[PDB]
Amino acid sequence: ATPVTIYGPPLSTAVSRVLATLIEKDVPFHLIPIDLSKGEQKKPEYLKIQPFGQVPAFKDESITLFESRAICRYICDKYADKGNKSLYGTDILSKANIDQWVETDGQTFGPPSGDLVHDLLFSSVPVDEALIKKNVDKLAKVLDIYEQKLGQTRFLAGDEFSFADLSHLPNGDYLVNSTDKGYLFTSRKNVNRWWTEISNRESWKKVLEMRKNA
Amino acid sequence: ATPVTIYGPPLSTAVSRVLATLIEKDVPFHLIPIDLSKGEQKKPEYLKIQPFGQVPAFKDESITLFESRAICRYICDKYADKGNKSLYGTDILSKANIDQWVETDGQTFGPPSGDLVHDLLFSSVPVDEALIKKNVDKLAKVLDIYEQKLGQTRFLAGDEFSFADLSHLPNGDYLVNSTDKGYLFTSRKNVNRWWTEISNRESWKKVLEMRKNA
Numbered sequence: 154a155t156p157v158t159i160y161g162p163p164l165s166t167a168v169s170r171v172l173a174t175l176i177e178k179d180v181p182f183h184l185i186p187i188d189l190s191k192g193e194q195k196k197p198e199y200l201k202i203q204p205f206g207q208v209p210a211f212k213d214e215s216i217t218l219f220e221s222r223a224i225c226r227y228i229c230d231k232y233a234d235k236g237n238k239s240l241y242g243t244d245i246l247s248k249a250n251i252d253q254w255v256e257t258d259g260q261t262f263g264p265p266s267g268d269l270v271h272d273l274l275f276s277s278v279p280v281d282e283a284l285i286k287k288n289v290d291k292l293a294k295v296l297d298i299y300e301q302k303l304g305q306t307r308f309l310a311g312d313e314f315s316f317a318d319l320s321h322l323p324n325g326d327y328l329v330n331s332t333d334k335g336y337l338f339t340s341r342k343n344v345n346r347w348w349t350e351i352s353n354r355e356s357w358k359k360v361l362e363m364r365k366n367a
Numbered sequence: 368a369t370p371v372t373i374y375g376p377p378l379s380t381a382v383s384r385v386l387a388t389l390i391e392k393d394v395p396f397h398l399i400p401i402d403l404s405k406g407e408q409k410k411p412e413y414l415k416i417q418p419f420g421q422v423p424a425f426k427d428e429s430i431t432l433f434e435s436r437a438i439c440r441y442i443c444d445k446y447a448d449k450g451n452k453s454l455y456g457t458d459i460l461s462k463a464n465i466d467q468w469v470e471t472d473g474q475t476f477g478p479p480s481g482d483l484v485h486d487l488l489f490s491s492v493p494v495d496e497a498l499i500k501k502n503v504d505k506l507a508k509v510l511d512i513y514e515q516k517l518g519q520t521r522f523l524a525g526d527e528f529s530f531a532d533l534s535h536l537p538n539g540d541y542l543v544n545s546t547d548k549g550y551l552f553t554s555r556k557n558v559n560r561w562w563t564e565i566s567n568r569e570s571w572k573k574v575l576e577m578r579k580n581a
């Protein structure tokens with residue numbers, strides 16, 4: 154079928170989540186730029202597609218979607234028999250087992266890690282060290298629980314890479330490789346192990362290379 | 368069939384989300400109390416099933432799950448042909464269409480509404496009115512977008528009540544009925560219509576009565 158259409162820059166964490174999923178699932182795509190520096194996402198034209206004025210948006214022959222994790226669940230559903238077939242499970246039980254850790258990204262890991270990424274890399278107000286520390290300490294608590302989980306299983310939800318792991322890549326990679334807070338991940342033995350395995354997957358390497366290609 | 372097991376108090380918003388789903392899906396359940404004021408959610412036996420020391424947790428013969436929205440997706444999947452069949456759609460496209468608004472709850476509406484609910488109703492320290500204002504203003508911006516959407520469709524995702532609407536009930540109901548922030552919903556005519564329709568569903572009324580009697 155025709156390549157799907159993704160709106161937004163690969164530097165965006167939420168866009169990156171979608172891109173990594175497409176690549177894992179062997180789904181071809183067009184990428185339409187949205188210039189965040191020109192406030193393009195906040196103007197009326199883009200608002201028809203993403204009503205919160207955020208990236209990414211998704212369009213294929215059947216539907217227009219927003220919210221990165223919903224886009225990714227759709228892709229995993231539509232293209233279940235394609236690419237990495239086990240990415241979001243293969244039946245009701247394996248899917249749900251992964252999904253609880255996807256929700257842990259969305260509700261538990263994502264808020265402090267995303268706020269850190271924003272405040273340290275993408276904000277225009279002076280960095281507030283007290284606020285950085287607050288979210289560092291919150292994220293440390295989460296990663297302590299991950300350290301124990303990853304002492305039992307190779308990946309968050311079990312023995313194989315899943316969307317739960319994938320969903321951690323965007324904020325993880327900015328913290329580890331673009332801030333001085335990488336020790337949160339790398340000083341925890343099992344988290345470091347996991348982080349190394351997931352960030353060196355072909356799909357993620359391809360996303361990082363796409364960022365270089367502008 | 369054997370009733371599923373749910374852990375936590377009905378005063379909890381995340382527990383309420385699961386209860387409303389079970390009732391919509393006509394799934395019998397057994398509810399195991401956890402007293403949050405007494406830290407029962409941190410008892411080591413309970414942390415074995417919910418490692419973040421939060422509620423709810425879910426058990427049936429097949430699986431133990433945490434994170435309310437993951438639990439609800441599993442319920443909707445397992446019991447697709449039961450109760451309200453359309454709650455999370457009936458095929459790939461209708462499911463995804465609902466799911467983007469479920470993610471909007473999780474990522475956009477949920478954080479400011481949940482922080483308001485916590486600071487105003489479940490905090491041990493005084494409220495910070497500057498922070499209240501910050502979250503009120505954030506939520507107002509979200510609801511301005513909903514106001515536009517709900518002028519186009521009856522419910523968030525279309526012409527039928529869905530899990531997307533359901534997922535807004537717990538924080539919405541506390542703000543409308545237990546704080547002086549209800550104007551956020553009631554001053555917006557389409558949002559108010561929607562709120563009226565979804566909060567008067569029998570499933571939601573049953574949850575509130577469970578809570579009143581707990």
Ligand SMILES: N[C@@H](CCC(=O)N[C@@H](CS)C(=O)NCC(=O)O)C(=O)O
Nearest residue numbers: 165166167206207208209220221474
């Ligand atoms: N919850 C959304 C988050 C989207 C989001 O916040 N995107 C950022 C880039 S990572 C954005 O659009 N920034 C520009 C803006 O918010 O105006 C998702 O997962 O898709």
Ligand SMILES: N[C@@H](CCC(=O)N[C@@H](CS)C(=O)NCC(=O)O)C(=O)O
Nearest residue numbers: 260379380381420421422423434435
């Ligand atoms: N993202 C979780 C949220 C769980 C959560 O924060 N639960 C509250 C109840 S509203 C709780 O357990 N609070 C007690 C605590 O965190 O110690 C879910 O949706 O299940």
